[PDB]
Design an enzyme around this catalytic site. Structure first.
Site, PDB file in Angstrom:
ATOM      1  N   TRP A 130       0.168  -1.156   0.162  1.00 62.68           N
ATOM      2  CA  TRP A 130      -0.154   0.091  -0.314  1.00 62.68           C
ATOM      3  C   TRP A 130       0.901   1.077   0.417  1.00 62.68           C
ATOM      4  O   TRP A 130      -0.020   2.282   0.179  1.00 62.68           O
ATOM      5  CB  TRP A 130      -1.429  -0.332   1.280  1.00 62.68           C
ATOM      6  CG  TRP A 130      -1.798  -1.739   1.365  1.00 62.68           C
ATOM      7  CD1 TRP A 130      -1.743  -2.457   2.077  1.00 62.68           C
ATOM      8  CD2 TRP A 130      -2.385  -1.927   0.726  1.00 62.68           C
ATOM      9  NE1 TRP A 130      -1.978  -3.411   2.107  1.00 62.68           N
ATOM     10  CE2 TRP A 130      -2.746  -3.496   1.207  1.00 62.68           C
ATOM     11  CE3 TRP A 130      -3.699  -1.111  -0.916  1.00 62.68           C
ATOM     12  CZ2 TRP A 130      -4.401  -3.850   0.416  1.00 62.68           C
ATOM     13  CZ3 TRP A 130      -5.031  -2.354  -0.941  1.00 62.68           C
ATOM     14  CH2 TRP A 130      -4.748  -2.533  -0.654  1.00 62.68           C
ATOM     15  N   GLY A 167      -6.765   5.388   1.812  1.00 62.02           N
ATOM     16  CA  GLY A 167      -5.938   5.277   2.467  1.00 62.02           C
ATOM     17  C   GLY A 167      -5.700   6.407   4.027  1.00 62.02           C
ATOM     18  O   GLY A 167      -5.000   6.264   4.194  1.00 62.02           O
ATOM     19  N   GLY A 168      -7.502   6.570   4.370  1.00 62.73           N
ATOM     20  CA  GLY A 168      -7.698   6.834   4.793  1.00 62.73           C
ATOM     21  C   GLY A 168      -7.783   8.629   5.404  1.00 62.73           C
ATOM     22  O   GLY A 168      -7.634   8.933   6.091  1.00 62.73           O
ATOM     23  N   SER A 208     -12.420   2.011   0.331  1.00 65.27           N
ATOM     24  CA  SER A 208     -11.981   2.981   1.773  1.00 65.27           C
ATOM     25  C   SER A 208     -12.105   3.993   1.982  1.00 65.27           C
ATOM     26  O   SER A 208     -13.455   4.142   1.611  1.00 65.27           O
ATOM     27  CB  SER A 208     -10.647   2.285   3.087  1.00 65.27           C
ATOM     28  OG  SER A 208     -10.304   2.625   4.170  1.00 65.27           O
ATOM     29  N   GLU A 245     -13.574  -6.821   8.305  1.00 66.93           N
ATOM     30  CA  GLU A 245     -13.326  -5.601   8.054  1.00 66.93           C
ATOM     31  C   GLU A 245     -12.124  -4.814   9.529  1.00 66.93           C
ATOM     32  O   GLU A 245     -11.083  -4.318   8.769  1.00 66.93           O
ATOM     33  CB  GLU A 245     -14.618  -4.506   7.887  1.00 66.93           C
ATOM     34  CG  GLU A 245     -14.324  -3.642   6.942  1.00 66.93           C
ATOM     35  CD  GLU A 245     -14.408  -3.993   5.792  1.00 66.93           C
ATOM     36  OE1 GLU A 245     -15.508  -4.126   4.461  1.00 66.93           O
ATOM     37  OE2 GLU A 245     -13.351  -4.293   5.072  1.00 66.93           O
ATOM     38  N   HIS A 287      -9.841  -6.228   5.601  1.00 68.44           N
ATOM     39  CA  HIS A 287      -9.301  -4.194   5.184  1.00 68.44           C
ATOM     40  C   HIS A 287      -8.975  -4.370   3.893  1.00 68.44           C
ATOM     41  O   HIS A 287      -8.064  -4.094   3.984  1.00 68.44           O
ATOM     42  CB  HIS A 287      -9.807  -3.679   6.268  1.00 68.44           C
ATOM     43  CG  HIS A 287     -10.380  -1.981   5.424  1.00 68.44           C
ATOM     44  ND1 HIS A 287     -11.734  -2.073   5.756  1.00 68.44           N
ATOM     45  CD2 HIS A 287     -10.210  -1.089   4.935  1.00 68.44           C
ATOM     46  CE1 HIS A 287     -11.782  -0.605   5.123  1.00 68.44           C
ATOM     47  NE2 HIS A 287     -11.161   0.054   4.652  1.00 68.44           N
TER      48      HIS A 287
END
Ligand SMILES: [Cl-]
Ligand SMILES: [Cl-]
Ligand SMILES: [Cl-]
Ligand SMILES: [Cl-]
Ligand SMILES: [Cl-]
Ligand SMILES: [Cl-]
Ligand SMILES: [Cl-]
Ligand SMILES: [Cl-]
Ligand SMILES: [Cl-]
Ligand SMILES: [Cl-]
Lengths: 527, 527
Positions: free
Chosen positions: A80, A114-115, A196, A323, A436
Site C-alpha cells: 500500500w 488510504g484513510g 475505504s 473489516e 480490509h
C-alpha cells in the site's frame, strides 16, 4: 503515434500486451495546475493549453504522504506504499482504453483509499488494463492530495477552505466530462468506484450537488460518507489546522498569516507533524480529512441522507467479512501479525479504550455486554473475535448498510454484497481473515494473470466480480439476466437482501449484522 | 371418634368422601399461643396443654389482611380472598391423612403466597385431600401473620423483631416434627412446597439454619428468596415501621414506646395504613415483608447463596409462562382485564416507570432497547407482550433460575419446570396467558374432580404433576423411572435443562430465557 487530442493538448500513450490482446494506456495525464507555492492548500486550478505532445507513458508522481514503516519488508503493509516519486506536483490521471478504440464506452473511475492520509492510483493492485481488456470498459484513475496538503481546513477562507482532495477528484471528473469522448467513452455513462476512504469519497460525490452531472452511478467498497471516520466537524477540522500551525511555529494573529507561514515550510515538515494534531489518536483517526466546508459539502452526511438530498441513481455497496482486524494490529494491546493474538478480557477492555477514548467508562461496559454473548463459552479466541467485530461493525459494516438502506428508502436501486473469501496470496496471518482492502485485487482482475499463481476458483471469482462490477456500470444492474446464474436482488429497506461473494457459490441472505447494527444505531448514540 | 393425641392435647377430625375413598382431615389445629395484645408483633409463643378434645373439624380464622376489591364479583381476583373470619387469632394448621392410617408417610407442607400481605391456607385451591387421596402423602397447611402484624420490623427489638411470619411458619414446622408421627408421618421425610411469597418463604427456610432439621426437601413454585421483591433491607424495613407509626400518630422518642402505641390501635387501623408507608409503590411492592433481622436471616439471600450457606438437599423450582401479566392489570397504564390492552410505545415507557421508579431515566432506555428486538415489526401487541416479559423475567423467572443454578453449583440436584398450559377454567382474559398462580389448581389435583368440568387432558396433566410433585417429596426424584415416561433430567449450571408442563407432552429444553436473563444479571446491576 497513439495520439489523442485533449482540450489542453495532444497526449501519447502505449499499447500493452494483456491476455493475448492490446489495451491503450495513457499514464500520467495532468488535469490541473500543480498546487505549488502560491497554490498550496487551495482548490485545484484548471489547466491551460500546452504546446507539443505530452508523453503519457509513465506513472506520475504520488502525492506527498507518510509511508507505512511499521513492518519493514512485509509485503502485506508495503504493498500500500507509493511506487512513484513523492511530490506536491501530483495532480495527474490515468486512462485505460480497450483496443480497438471503442465508441460510447462505459467509463469506470477509481478513487483509491488510504484513510485520507495516504494512497496513489499507480499501485499495481489498481491497474485497470485487465478491466479494460476483459470487460471492454474505460478505466480512469486519479491522484488527489492527502493529509494537510489536501484537507487543511479554514472554513470560508479560499487560501485553505478544506476538502481540497475532494475538489481534486471533482476536477478529474470534469476532465473526463470534457475529454473522454476523444478516447471513445460516454461521459453520460460514468461510474465511480472506490475503496475505504475512496468509497467515502465516492459517496461524498453523491452528496455534493456540484459532482452530480459528472457521473452516473456509484460503487462503494468497504466505506461510506456516513462512516464515523469519514467526515469531521468544521470546528474540529479548524482546531487541527491551528494545532499543526502551533506545532510548526506558524501560530499567528491572522488566518491568512497562518497560511502564509505554512506555505513556507517544507512539505516534509508538514508531514512530520500531522500525527500530533489530535489529542487521543485511535488507529482509525483521520488527521486531516473531509469536513463541512459549505462548498463541496454543506452539511453532515447523516443530515443530508435524512433529508433525501443526494444524487438519485443506482448504487452498489458492500463490505468484507473481517473489516476491523487490520486496525487491531496497529495499536490495540495484545495483537500482532506474528501470533494468534489471543487476548484476555482486560485486553479487550483496553482495546475499546483505544478505539473509543471519548466514550464514558460506562459506555464501554455497554459495548462489552453486547459482544460477549458467547456461542461457545470456552473458545480461547472469543475476545479476539469480539474486538475485531466491534471495529468492523461500528466503523464500516453498519454505516455501509445505513447508506444503502437510506438510498432504498428514497426509491433507488441498491445492491449489497458480502465479500468472504480470504485470498491465497494474502500476506497477513490467517486469523485476520478476509481483511480490509483485499477484495481490490479481485475487482481489478489480478487473479486472471496466471503468473501470479492464484487458484482456479479465484480466477472464476474474480471474473464474476469484474462481470458484476462492469455490468452495473454499463446497465445499472450487476446481473447477467438470462444465463441462469445467481440473480443479485435489489437491496430493500425491509427484507434487506444481499449477495455473498466467495469461491464456493454466490448466495442470497438477509439483514446482515442486523443485531449488532441495531446496537450502534439505536443505543450507542444514547452513550 | 377419630382422636389423635398431640403433645398439647387430643384433637378430633373428620372422614371425607374423596373419589370413592376416605381422607382424614384435621382442620384448624392451633400450633401457637394467639398473638394478641401483649403478644402482637412478637415471635410466636409455644403452646401449653389444653384439657379435653379440641374439635378440629373447621377451617380456622384467616390472618388479618386487606382484601382485593379491585373487581367486585370477579372470580379471578376474589378466589384469592380469605374464606374464613379475619382475626389476629389465626395461628392454626391443617392436616390431611390418607385412609387407612399410613405408617412413615411422606409429608408435604404447603406455604401459601400473597405478596406477604394476604393469603390463607383454607382456600379451596389449597385443599390437600386430593393429594392425600391420590398420592398417599400427608399434606400440612398453615396460616401465618401477614402485613405489619407479621413483618413489622425493629431489628434487635424482641417486641417487634421482624420476620414474625417466617417464625410462624417455623413453629408450625416444629409442630410437625413433634406430632406428625402420631398422624402416621415421617418427620424425617417432610417437603416444603409453596407458591409466590410462599415459594420465597420456602427458599428462606433453606437459608435459615434454624429451619434445617425441620424439613427434608423443598419445592419452589413461581418464587424464590433471591427475587427482587422477596427480602428488603433492614433499614428499609425500619423506615416503614416509623412511617406506619407516623401515619397512626404513634411516633415516639423510644422504640418500645412506638410498639406500645401500635399495640393499642385496632388491627384494622394498621391494615388501613400499610399501603402508605412506601414512597413510590409499584404493583409488586411489599409493604411489610421479610428482612435481614439477624435471627431467621443473617444476610441477604444473594450473599448467602454466593457463600454456599444454605441447606444442602434436592429442590424443585419452576415458573409459569406469563408470570408478569397479572401485575400489569393492577396499575400499569393502558392495561385492563376487559380488553386486549394494546399499548403504545409511550405507554410501555410509562409502564417501566411504574415498575422501576428508582431506575435512572437512562436505565429504562436500556430496558426499552433490550426488549424491542421485534420478531415481527408490525405485531400490534408487540409492546403489550414486551412489558409482560419485562415483569416476568426480572421479578420471577430469572431469580428462580439463579436460585436453581446456585444450588447446582454446590452439588445439589435441582429440577426446573416451565408450566405453559392456560387453564380452561381461568377467569382472566386470554391475552394474560398462563398467569401467576394458576398452576396451583393442578398441583392440588382440582381437575381430578369431574364436577368442576376440566378437560380430560387437564386431568391427565394434573395427575402427572401430582405424581411428579409427590415422587420428589418421597424419593428426591420427580420421575417414574421405568414406565418409559419422559425422564425429568437434573438441572445443571452448564446445560441448564428443564422440563415443560402442558396438555400436549412434556419436553426437555435448555437455557430458559437465557438471553433476557443475561441482561438483568450482567448489565442491569450496572444501572
Ligand atoms: Cl507522465
Ligand atoms: Cl470494443
Ligand atoms: Cl479474457
Ligand atoms: Cl516563524
Ligand atoms: Cl455541520
Ligand atoms: Cl378449629
Ligand atoms: Cl397407605
Ligand atoms: Cl385415584
Ligand atoms: Cl397517641
Ligand atoms: Cl444486609
Amino acid at each position: 503515434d497513439i495520439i489523442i487530442t485533449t482540450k489542453n493538448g495532444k497526449v501519447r500513450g502505449m499499447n500493452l500486451t494483456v491476455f493475448g490482446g492490446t489495451v491503450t494506456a495513457f499514464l500520467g495525464i495532468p488535469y490541473a495546475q500543480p498546487p505549488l507555492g502560491r497554490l498550496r492548500f487551495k482548490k485545484p486550478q484548471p489547466l491551460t493549453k500546452w504546446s507539443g505532445i505530452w508523453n503519457a507513458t509513465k506513472y506520475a508522481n504520488s502525492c506527498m504522504q507518510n509511508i507505512d514503516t511499521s513492518f519493514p519488508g512485509f509485503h502485506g503493509s508495503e504493498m500500500w506504499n507509493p511506487n512513484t516519486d513523492l511530490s506536491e506536483d501530483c495532480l495527474y490521471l490515468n486512462v485505460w482504453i480497450p483496443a480497438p478504440k471503442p465508441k460510447n464506452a462505459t467509463v469506470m473511475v477509481w478513487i483509491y483509499g488510504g484513510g485520507f492520509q495516504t494512497g496513489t492510483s499507480s499501485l499495481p493492485v489498481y491497474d485497470g488494463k485487465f478491466l479494460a481488456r476483459v470487460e471492454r470498459v474505460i478505466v480512469v484513475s486519479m491522484n488527489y492530495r492527502v493529509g494537510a496538503l489536501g484537507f487543511l481546513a479554514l472554513p470560508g477562507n479560499p487560501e485553505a477552505p478544506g476538502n481540497m482532495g475532494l475538489f481534486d477528484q471533482q476536477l478529474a471528473l470534469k476532465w473526463v466530462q470534457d475529454n473522454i469522448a476523444a478516447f471513445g467513452g460516454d461521459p453520460n455513462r460514468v461510474t465511480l468506484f472506490g475503496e475505504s476512504a475512496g468509497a467515502a469519497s465516492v459517496s461524498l460525490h453523491l452528496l455534493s450537488p456540484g459532482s452530480h452531472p459528472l457521473f452516473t452511478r456509484a460503487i462503494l467498497q468497504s466505506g461510506s460518507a456516513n462512516a464515523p471516520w469519514a467526515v469531521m466537524s468544521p470546528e474540529e477540522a479548524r482546531n487541527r489546522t491551528l494545532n499543526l500551525a502551533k506545532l510548526l511555529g506558524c501560530s499567528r494573529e491572522n488566518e491568512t498569516e497562518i497560511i502564509k507561514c505554512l506555505r513556507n515550510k517544507d512539505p516534509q515538515e508538514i508531514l512530520d507533524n500531522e500525527a500530533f494534531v489530535v489529542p487521543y489518536s485511535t488507529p482509525l483517526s483521520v488527521n486531516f480529512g473531509p469536513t463541512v466546508d459549505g462548498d463541496f459539502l454543506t452539511d453532515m452526511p447523516d443530515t443530508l441522507l435524512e433529508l433525501g438530498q443526494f444524487k438519485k441513481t443506482q448504487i452498489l455497496v458492500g463490505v468484507n467479512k473481517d473489516e476491523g482486524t487490520a486496525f487491531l494490529v496497529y495499536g490495540a494491546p495484545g495483537f500482532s501479525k506474528d501470533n494468534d493474538s489471543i487476548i484476555t478480557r482486560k485486553e479487550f477492555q483496553e482495546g475499546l479504550k483505544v478505539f473509543f477514548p471519548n466514550v464514558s467508562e460506562f459506555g464501554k461496559e455497554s459495548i462489552l455486554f453486547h459482544y460477549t454473548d458467547w456461542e461457545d463459552e470456552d473458545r480461547p479466541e472469543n475476545y479476539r473475535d469480539a474486538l475485531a467485530e466491534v471495529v468492523g461493525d461500528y466503523f464500516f459494516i453498519c454505516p455501509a448498510l445505513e447508506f444503502a438502506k437510506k438510498y432504498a428508502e428514497h426509491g433507488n436501486n441498491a445492491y449489497f454484497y458480502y465479500f468472504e473469501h480470504r485470498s491465497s496470496k494474502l500476506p497477513w496471518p490467517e486469523w485476520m481473515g478476509v481483511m480490509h482492502g483485499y477484495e481490490i485485487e479481485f475487482v481489478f482482475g489480478l487473479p486472471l494473470e496466471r503468473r501470479l499463481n492464484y487458484t482456479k476458483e479465484e480466477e472464476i471469482l474474480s471474473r464474476e466480480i469484474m462481470r458484476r462490477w462492469a455490468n452495473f456500470a454499463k446497465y445499472g444492474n450487476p446481473n447477467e439476466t438470462q444465463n441462469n446464474s445467481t440473480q443479485w436482488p435489489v437491496f430493500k429497506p425491509t427484507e434487506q437482501k444481499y449477495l455473498t461473494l466467495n469461491t464456493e457459490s454466490s448466495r442470497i441472505m438477509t439483514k446482515l449484522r442486523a443485531q449488532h447494527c441495531r446496537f450502534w444505531n439505536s443505543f450507542f448514540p444514547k452513550v
